[PDB]
Amino acid sequence: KNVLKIRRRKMNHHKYRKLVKKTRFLRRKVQEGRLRRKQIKFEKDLRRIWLKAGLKEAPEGWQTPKIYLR
Amino acid sequence: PRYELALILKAMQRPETAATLKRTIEALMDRGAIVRDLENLGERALPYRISAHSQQHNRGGYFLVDFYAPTAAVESMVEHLSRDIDVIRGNIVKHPLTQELKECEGIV
Amino acid sequence: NEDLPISMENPYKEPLKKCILCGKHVDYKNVQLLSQFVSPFTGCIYGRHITGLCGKKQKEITKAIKRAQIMGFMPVTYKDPAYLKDPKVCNIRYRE
Amino acid sequence: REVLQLQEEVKNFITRENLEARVEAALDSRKNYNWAITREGLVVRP
Amino acid sequence: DDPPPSTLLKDYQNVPGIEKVDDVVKRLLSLEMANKKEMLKIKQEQFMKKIVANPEDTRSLEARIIALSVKIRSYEEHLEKHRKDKAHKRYLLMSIDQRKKMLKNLRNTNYDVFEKICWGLGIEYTFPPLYYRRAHRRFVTKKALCIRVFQETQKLKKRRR
Amino acid sequence: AKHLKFIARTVMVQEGNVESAYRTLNRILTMDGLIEDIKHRRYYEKPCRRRQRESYERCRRIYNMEMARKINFLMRKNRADPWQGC
RNA sequence: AAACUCCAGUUGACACAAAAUAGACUACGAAAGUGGCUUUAACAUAUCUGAACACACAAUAGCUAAGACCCAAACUGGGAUUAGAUACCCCACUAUGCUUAGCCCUAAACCUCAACAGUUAAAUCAACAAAACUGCUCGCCAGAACACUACGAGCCACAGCUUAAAACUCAAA
Numbered sequence A: 001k002n003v004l005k006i007r008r009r010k011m012n013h014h015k016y017r018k019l020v021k022k023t024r025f026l027r028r029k030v031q032e033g034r035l036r037r038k039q040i041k042f043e044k045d046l047r048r049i050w051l052k053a054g055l056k057e058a059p060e061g062w063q064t065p066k067i068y069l070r
Numbered sequence B: 001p002r003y004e005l006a007l008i009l010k011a012m013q014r015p016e017t018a019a020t021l022k023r024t025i026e027a028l029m030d031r032g033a034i035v036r037d038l039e040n041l042g043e044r045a046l047p048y049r050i051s052a053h054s055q056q057h058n059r060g061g062y063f064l065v066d067f068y069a070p071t072a073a074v075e076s077m078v079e080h081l082s083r084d085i086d087v088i089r090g091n092i093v094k095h096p097l098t099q100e101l102k103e104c105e106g107i108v
Numbered sequence C: 001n002e003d004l005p006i007s008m009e010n011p012y013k014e015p016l017k018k019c020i021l022c023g024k025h026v027d028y029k030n031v032q033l034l035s036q037f038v039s040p041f042t043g044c045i046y047g048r049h050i051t052g053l054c055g056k057k058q059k060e061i062t063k064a065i066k067r068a069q070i071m072g073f074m075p076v077t078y079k080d081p082a083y084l085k086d087p088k089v090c091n092i093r094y095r096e
Numbered sequence D: 001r002e003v004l005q006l007q008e009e010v011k012n013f014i015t016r017e018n019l020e021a022r023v024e025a026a027l028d029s030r031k032n033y034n035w036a037i038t039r040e041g042l043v044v045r046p
Numbered sequence E: 001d002d003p004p005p006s007t008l009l010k011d012y013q014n015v016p017g018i019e020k021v022d023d024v025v026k027r028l029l030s031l032e033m034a035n036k037k038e039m040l041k042i043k044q045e046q047f048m049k050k051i052v053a054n055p056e057d058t059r060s061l062e063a064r065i066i067a068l069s070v071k072i073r074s075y076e077e078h079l080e081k082h083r084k085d086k087a088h089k090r091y092l093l094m095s096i097d098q099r100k101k102m103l104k105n106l107r108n109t110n111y112d113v114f115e116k117i118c119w120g121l122g123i124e125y126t127f128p129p130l131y132y133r134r135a136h137r138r139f140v141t142k143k144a145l146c147i148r149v150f151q152e153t154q155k156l157k158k159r160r161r
Numbered sequence F: 001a002k003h004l005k006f007i008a009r010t011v012m013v014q015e016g017n018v019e020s021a022y023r024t025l026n027r028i029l030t031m032d033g034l035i036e037d038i039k040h041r042r043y044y045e046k047p048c049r050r051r052q053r054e055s056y057e058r059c060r061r062i063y064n065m066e067m068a069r070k071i072n073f074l075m076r077k078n079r080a081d082p083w084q085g086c
Numbered sequence G: 001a002a003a004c005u006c007c008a009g010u011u012g013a014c015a016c017a018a019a020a021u022a023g024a025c026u027a028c029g030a031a032a033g034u035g036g037c038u039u040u041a042a043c044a045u046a047u048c049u050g051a052a053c054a055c056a057c058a059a060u061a062g063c064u065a066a067g068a069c070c071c072a073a074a075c076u077g078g079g080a081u082u083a084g085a086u087a088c089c090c091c092a093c094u095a096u097g098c099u100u101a102g103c104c105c106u107a108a109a110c111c112u113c114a115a116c117a118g119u120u121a122a123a124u125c126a127a128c129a130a131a132a133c134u135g136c137u138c139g140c141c142a143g144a145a146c147a148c149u150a151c152g153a154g155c156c157a158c159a160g161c162u163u164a165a166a167a168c169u170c171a172a173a
């Protein structure tokens, strides 16, 4: 069997785990910003729906839940 | 179903042994058992020293109680056998006779 | 032709070999029998290459021995000395 | 056949009436389950 | 409801003179002195007598449905006490799926027997879903909003007209 | 601990032959597997290693018995040549 | 050498840990797994196939709460060795291995053989592995690396898991 392929998989994985450790803090900020933008996009899509329907505002009693914040 | 209770009782005199046997059979009947027969295997030295109810036993009386009881009774009986101070060790098994003696054609 | 061979099961087929306990009931209370398959010095259960028993009866003997040992009928670390003079059925010799 | 056998067997079962006598008789009895086997496959009763 | 514990075993119910025996024999040959399997057999026999046209024919689809229903009830009773028995949970789910398949076949072949089976065993036949897709948070919230918006649109249209 | 003493793994000496009694006891303990069990229990053997070892010994024994059977079966032909010259 | 000397030997009492021998057996379970004893429940389907996502499960490791703690032991100290030892050897002791209620969903999770049905006739047949094939169905694959990666989406997971590319490069792999 290909032992080079498994050793290449090991080196690639080990190198990757070093990168995430080094940049763990920068990654967290990127992820939280991405989640914020994704929530904003979801809200915009919902607003698009109730605007196209005809309603000038959201359905009575409706509050867009935060479905991505941990 | 049909069960066999193997009872290792304390080495006592005849009156206390009779009283303990009567109490055990009475508990069996109270839990709904139909007792078929009571066998005495004898008073003998235990294969090993057994510690029960803060007492050490090297000798004991061996008895067998064959009976028919509902499935729910067995657990209860076990707990009762745990409380009786004159019982060194009680064990309920499915009666060996109910086990079927399948026949063999020999070594293939 | 009347002399042609006829289809038939082997009439000379010898009866298939039996273990010494075949057809007999193994009970956990029969400590005398269960003691014939344990080491006199350590109480260890002999394997089938020593006892000569079949797989089914080997399993039956093992289960009966364990049940008797745990229920206070048979010693574990040695064979009961009362059964040391019973017939020897195991193929083992300590030159003792 | 099984029902008839059970019916005749029940006559010897222990009840609340014969418990004293049966316990006493069992105390004055001894049952032996021990028997050995030989290399020829024969049972040796004690 | 379970059969009363005094009921005789399935194999000891047609024996001649079984009513002319002692009470102890009756207790010994009853469900009280037997495992749960004999009691399940008595349920199966009762359901067969109550539902199927020929109670002796165990080869019909209805008879198999009755037997699997008894088995499913047994599995559910086991799992009420044994919550962490994953193997028996698997067995229950598999038996439910098999009974659904048999019920579909019975409906496709014999609708009258299908109705009798559904009424007798208390089974509420359900049609399978058309699509199998995850209902994640985004989809669920979006669908709820869409339903609400449709309701408000209907109200506004009613007010206009 | 809870058993009677001087019954298990006990050998009596005959005519003051203590060395013979010790060697008999050693034979008994080795035959019953106690010696190898004690030696193997000094360090923990991993379950996978235990399974591999057991399979290896079982197959080794089977192969050795089969080879011994073959050699014994073919040993009959090892006699003086009856057709020497031709 | 450290360590202990509230140490060591016999005897007696004494687990929420682990389950010699049997087992040279090859069984149960869908797989993962399952080898001390008793008892109660209990191991789907009288066509077959049928899912990364549906419904259920999934070794070891790991994360939350509480509890138990003999032994073992990442980590952490001490002793020794070494040019150095942030390792190997010795001692001690944690997380963890255990129970309860939730998660996490990964393995060389492999018999490295997809499920059912059928054949032993043909040149048997690249090679090796494990004799060679046929019918039918689902899943998957179309040079290497980039890449068990990036982005998107989903997830009780937040240094995580599933799915999973492209650009540049090469004549190989």
Ligand SMILES: NC(=O)c1ccc[n+]([C@@H]2O[C@H](COP(=O)([O-])OP(=O)(O)OC[C@H]3O[C@@H](n4cnc5c(N)ncnc54)[C@H](O)[C@@H]3O)[C@@H](O)[C@H]2O)c1
Pocket: E130, E131, E132, E133, E134, G051, G053, G054
């Ligand atoms: N997508 C469905 O809901 C659906 C409904 C009926 C039948 N099927 C059949 O399932 C097969 C697979 O279809 P696909 O490639 O587009 O799915 P897919 O594998 O590409 O996944 C997309 C969706 O289809 C579902 N899916 C996947 N396999 C399925 C199956 N066997 N049955 C039902 N749903 C399945 C998944 O849950 C997922 O939500 C097709 O033969 C299709 O005819 C699919």
Ligand code: FES
Pocket: B104, B105, B106, B107, C017, C018, C019, C021, C022, C023, C053, C054, C055, C056, C057
């Ligand atoms: S050979 Fe028949 S039971 Fe062992």
Ligand SMILES: [K+]
Pocket: G110
């Ligand atoms: K493998």
Ligand SMILES: [Mg+2]
Pocket: none
């Ligand atoms: Mg299927």
Ligand SMILES: [Mg+2]
Pocket: none
């Ligand atoms: Mg698909």
Ligand SMILES: [Mg+2]
Pocket: none
């Ligand atoms: Mg897991």
Ligand SMILES: [Mg+2]
Pocket: none
């Ligand atoms: Mg854990």
Ligand SMILES: [Mg+2]
Pocket: none
């Ligand atoms: Mg595995």
Ligand SMILES: [Mg+2]
Pocket: G114, G115, G138
């Ligand atoms: Mg498949």
Ligand SMILES: [Mg+2]
Pocket: G139
């Ligand atoms: Mg598939």
Ligand SMILES: [Mg+2]
Pocket: none
């Ligand atoms: Mg490629």
Ligand SMILES: [Mg+2]
Pocket: none
């Ligand atoms: Mg990834």
